[PDB]
Design a binder for this molecule. Structure first.
Ligand SMILES: [Zn+2]
Lengths: 338, 61, 341, 61
């Protein structure tokens, strides 16, 4: 199985590409690199790169100021970027709801049913992000064909996919109580019990809709980012297993910040060669553990990578696997420039 | 409303507001603040869970 | 403020149990070794046992001496002994003999045990811990001398100490088992009674044992836990979790050792640009750790690249748990150990 | 004994034996083998839990 993401980068079928990874892994650079490599290989298509990481460093990475509103990448025609905060977004929707005792009871009603089930917020939040993307398209006039999602490194953004069945059991729980109301009560209350049922069914609907998409391996895949160090690797196995338990396609693993000290012309660093020894021990381990994955081994370029010019230079190695012998010059130019 | 419910609401709300605030902070760029908040949420969660049980038992039939 | 070192713990005399743990690539073992050595050096009148249950079994490499299940003196010291043990292996061997010593009667008693014991988490870990203790006692009585403090190098995976919560739930199901056996009639109480009484007894012994442990692990003057970590998000995160866990058990945790620090500004030569890049990350989190655990002893240890091996080098390196390493003055001590390698 | 129980025992035992074996392997010095074993334990755990439920329901009153 090819040690690069070339199939993904040439894929016509995908609309959703999630990129996630915990704790210091070059998740964002890897997000960018992917977005770009697809934008190049498919100029006949429009790509949205969106990010919910509160670090909000799409702007630093590209060297260009992005925000809630899509904005074309300077130097490209088919790559746009937004940074959004889903909690903030949802906050704003709920504060609007408020302004528009009756409400207290219904608010109470909802909470009782809902404030207790895990993932409701996460889903509401994701919904609002979908809707916000749509408003960007309808304003611009174009649409996006693929979004590449740079996911927040902490939390369970996609656990709301188990929600639909839960929402079902409790639609009934609630249905078997509202039945026991009589005429007098069903008169003062009925209308708002009808609303409580409404919202709940809508949420289930929406989520089920999302599910059908997310669960189509042709339509949506997840790329894990990690480094070669027990804790990240372990966190990364965890991530896969979770994702699998959501019937979501997880097929690629980018491994970042490899030192490849052996193939080095500095050789100056015993500390670096020491680190490299560990990195390679685990690297062997990955090899015999995810045998049916595209496991892509990326080089450490010291300091940071910024500018579409640099990002692109670096991004090529998701497509054609970096050979430290031959390809060294590229990394050591990038490094020396920073 | 009894002081017990008044407080349950208050906490439940404090907790919510804290959660959304923490979701806007970068765990890596603000490890300390982020962690502190996580602690206060876990704490609020235990207080909330008590007040709930206390309210539920006190309204049972 | 709280001294950035372990001098307090190193000079303490009340402590019988010092647990050292950290997840995943952190210098845990070396840390354990250094704490033991320093304690022994500072308390020549007391007797220390450093015990490791880490499957990697690299006490032997750390000291450059073959340690095993039988406690044995560190060569060059009169009050430090090491031993390596596999608790699961030990427990396994215990149950092989319990089985040998007892076919339907034994299957039923086996099954009954299983239905009460199997589901509950931490049982195997308590039994396991108990076997280790029995073992240490047998070592003491055999060698004719006892240990004053044990220093425990814990395995980097699993939950060594999550059985401290067991006695409560054992009490619960002891009464469940009770309510059922109270409904046996004279006949069945005759064919089974003895087995029922053995089962009850078995459980009570475990509860009592665990309670006996728990009273000790819960005394902050008697036992404490030192977390080991490195200055990187993932580890720091796991470290907080571990602290929180420990606290949930009412265990005393006051110390954190942060290893593998580059201190790259304070040494131009051993640090290529890649290292300086890394040190910036490490430094970032150091500032965080500082505001996050102000009432903790957080001890900043320098990366000594390569690997520390031998009583001599271990000692040279261990001094920095006692007197905070200053990367300026103390520099030459490190790059001396490194360069030897 | 019915085949169902025969198999429940067998698995429950396979699982136990595997757990003690895995506890003797170093997760760091053997990341791959260790991980594979963890997967098999999580798997056996689900099979065991089913066989249990099936045995319990099948013996209820
Ligand atoms: Zn270096």
């Amino acid at each position: 199985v090819e040690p690069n993401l070339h199939s993904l980068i040439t894929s016509t079928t995908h609309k959703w590409i999630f990129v996630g990874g915990k704790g210091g892994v070059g998740k964002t650079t890897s997000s960018c690199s992917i977005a770009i490599q697809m934008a190049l290989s498919q100029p006949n298509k429009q790509f949205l790169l969106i990010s919910t990481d509160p670090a909000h460093n799409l702007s630093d990475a590209f060297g260009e100021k992005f925000g809630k509103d899509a904005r074309k990448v300077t130097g490209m025609n088919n790559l746009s970027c937004m940074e959004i905060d889903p909690s903030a977004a949802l906050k704003d929707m709920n504060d609007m709801a408020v302004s528009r005792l009756g409400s207290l009871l219904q608010g109470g009603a909802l909470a009782d049913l809902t404030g207790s089930i895990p993932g409701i917020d996460e889903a509401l939040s994701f919904m609002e992000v979908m809707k916000h993307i749509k408003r960007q398209e309808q304003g611009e006039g174009e649409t996006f064909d693929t979004v590449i999602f740079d996911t927040a490194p902490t939390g369970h953004t996609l656990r709301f996919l188990q929600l639909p069945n839960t929402l079902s059991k409790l639609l009934e729980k609630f249905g078997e109580i509202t039945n026991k109301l009589g005429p007098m009560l069903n008169s003062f209350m009925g209308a708002g019990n009808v609303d409580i049922s409404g919202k709940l069914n809508e949420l289930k609907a929406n989520v089920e809709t999302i599910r059908q998409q997310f669960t189509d391996p042709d339509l949506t895949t997840f790329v894990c980012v990690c480094i070669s160090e027990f804790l990240s690797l372990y966190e990364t196995e965890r991530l896969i297993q979770e994702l699998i338990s959501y019937d979501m396609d997880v097929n690629s693993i980018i491994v970042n910040q490899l030192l490849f000290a052996e193939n080095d012309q500095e050789h100056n660093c015993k500390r670096c060669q020491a680190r490299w020894k560990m990195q390679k021990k685990y690297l062997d381990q990955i090899d015999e553990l995810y045998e049916d994955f595209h496991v892509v081994k990326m080089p450490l370029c010291a300091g940071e990578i910024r500018g579409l010019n640099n990002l692109t230079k670096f991004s090529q190695f998701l497509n054609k696997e970096y050979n430290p012998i031959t390809d060294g010059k590229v990394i050591y130019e990038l490094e020396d420039k920073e | 409303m009894n002081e017990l419910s008044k407080k349950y609401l208050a906490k439940v709300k404090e907790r919510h507001e804290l959660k959304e605030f923490n979701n806007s902070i970068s765990a890596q760029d603000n490890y300390a603040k982020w962690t502190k908040n996580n602690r206060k949420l876990d704490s609020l969660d235990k207080e909330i869970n008590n007040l709930k049980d206390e309210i539920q038992s006190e309204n049972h039939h």
